[PDB]
């Protein structure tokens with residue numbers, strides 16, 4: 123024989139678990155970095171605890187399968203390695219192997235040790251005339267009894283599903299079969315089974331009828347992407363709804379641990395819903411704060427002295443894990459909030475028309491604006507005569523002081539723009555306005571000035587039917603005003619728009635278009651692409667922690683009594699309205715250039731840098747996003763073409779073909795007959811599909827997510843709901859608008875209690891964990907032994923670092939006013955790198971928060 127030398131790196135559960143790690147939380151990657159010696163439970167791993175068994179890649183047994191070595195136990199502790207790193211522990215193991223058994227390509231592992239551990243890697247050396255073999259594992263290994271068929275890990279090498287090494291073919295297939303899981307059964311914590319189900323788990327019909335919520339997906343009225351199957355028992359009152367639980371399953375390895383408490387952000391969110399909200403609600407159902415803001419100064423005091431609570435309410439939020447690192451305190455009565463970047467230079471610049479318009483290009487929701495093609499604008503609604511008979515903005519509403527073009531000449535010269543929030547809310551408005559909320563369906567028209575800035579020209583506030591449903595829109599239109607009560611009216615008009623925009627952003631731009639729509643791709647990938655497949659490795663970093671934050675959203679955010687329903691305009695109709703909007707979702711229109719063209723914000727042009735020409739040059743989201751889109755596309759093209767020799771080779775790949783078919787027909791299965799799905803008959807289609815997935819998971823989510831507190835941490839700038847209609851004529855509220863307009867604004871928008879909820883949640887959502895892995899050429903360890911892919915990944919990051927410098931440069935260009943605004947807030951949201959915390963920058967690989 124020979125002895126093959128193995129090095130196993132693993133991490134203990136205590137080093138990664140929230141419950142244990144609450145006493146470990148300030149400047150991590152550290153602490154004499156855990157080498158595995160003096161606190162030392164490392165001896166427990168040594169005797170008859172953990173067995174590893176190598177599987178030959180080149181020598182088969184009687185019936186095709188790779189030859190098994192001898193199950194071998196960990197024989198010793200390695201105290202130090204130059205590459206060790208925090209929280210890790212290393213073990214030496216030596217394997218009996220000969221020439222005649224060939225080359226290992228996989229291994230089985232059994233944990234007999236009761237407590238699960240996180241296996242990081244195996245390195246094998248001293249194999250004659252062959253280099254070292256590396257296994258990247260990154261998986262939790264539960265007790266061996268729990269399993270039926272052992273945990274298996276493959277070496278570093280990427281192989282197309284000709285399945286390469288013949289002795290390994292059956293091992294590759296069987297593990298893919300184990301991951302699919304059969305389709306029945308209640309899922310358990312230690313399981314790694316990926317499957318699909320509809321969104322039937324958000325409501326709570328056992329609590330009553332008013333807690334039931336419609337099934338989303340699997341029907342034509344409310345189509346939806348699928349989510350991860352959790353197979354709990356159904357509810358008593360409804361066989362089609364899944365019963366609620368405080369713990370939701372996701373396939374183990376999709377839930378990431380952290381070395382630092384304070385990086386456990388989903389745990390912080392869960393605490394805000396469960397512990398913090400009922401406590402804070404007790405103080406309003408009490409007394410110790412007034413239930414309403416009375417001035418703008420009272421809102422600003424949130425970031426100064428904070429808001430005063432009593433000791434025992436604030437002593438029950440001061441020592442909770444994670445939240446004591448993200449909440450401030452002055453002694454023992456003040457809950458305080460960090461000042462949002464929007465007011466750091468100017469307290470009042472958000473009120474400006476310039477800033478209002480600039481946030482449509484560079485704000486939290488910079489994706490919706492479109493170029494006005496024809497005039498007035500029109501609705502896509504079926505047969506009511508605002509749709510059948512348009513918006514009520516006329517041509518004489520739009521002649522202020524700037525140009526004196528006709529409406530027709532501004533349209534000709536691409537100078538008129540539209541923010542249309544009319545259609546999604548319109549069919550639900552009567553129901554919405556029968557509750558505590560009072561809302562309008564809005565449209566706004568914007569004009570590109572000669573200085574390259576945008577200004578709002580008209581706001582249409584539309585209502586549905588004083589009598590009827592047929593006969594269309596009851597609309598009022600409002601015009602900019604500099605002074606008098608008319609400016610206060612105009613400011614309230616803008617508030618009704620932003621309230622529409624905030625809610626659309628939350629449910630559609632953020633929840634639907636990134637979180638919900640990405641989840642079926644994670645499921646399809648794991649069920650059908652082996653860990654060894656090139657395309658699995660390309661896509662994998664972009665899925666990190668997404669099923670985790672989504673499972674928490676189902677539990678705490680988007681559920682029947684939850685945060686979004688209590689905080690935002692659409693209320694109890696929030697999620698189902700986003701299913702209505704999903705009717706219009708098309709995969710290939712999510713590609714940044716396609717999106718820009720569809721909204722008329724760009725035109726096709728070969729002489730321009732990225733092949734498109736921008737109507738509106740200073741559109742910060744778009745100009746910056748186009749650099750990042752191209753860096754992603756180039757990376758994915760170079761990668762894809764490393765592996766697929768021809769279009770036939772891709773057509774022959776059974777794992778890719780099965781992946782895509784199940785994606786289209788099951789995961790986004792309500793859209794299975796749509797003609798725009800790429801077939802996967804061409805390498806170019808694989809490039810485009812992968813580019814769209816990575817764009818979505820990385821920069822699109824970053825752009826739409828990390829500005830939420832910096833722009834909307836002042837509730838005055840991004841209100842989430844409205845609760846009064848416009849003061850009319852000779853009202854007592856109109857007169858109140860004359861004498862005390864701050865109080866009239868405050869009475870229209872989100873109340874104080876729901877403001878505190880909104881701020882606490884979006885402060886968490888807008889934070890980067892310290893162990894975030896960024897686009898900025900980052901990966902976890904050493905994912906492949908293919909050096910051509912490593913070099914190509916290297917070029918991807920050098921391109922990203924060069925793009926970061928180009929973007930910083932643009933922020934210092936005085937000509938580019940939309941990048942900063944009157945609010946002097948440089949657009950850094952698409953800068954790839956970031957440090958940690960409430961940073962208005964940084965593009966994570968994945969939807970991680």
Ligand SMILES: [Fe+2]
Nearest residue numbers: 637827969971
């Ligand atoms: Fe998010």
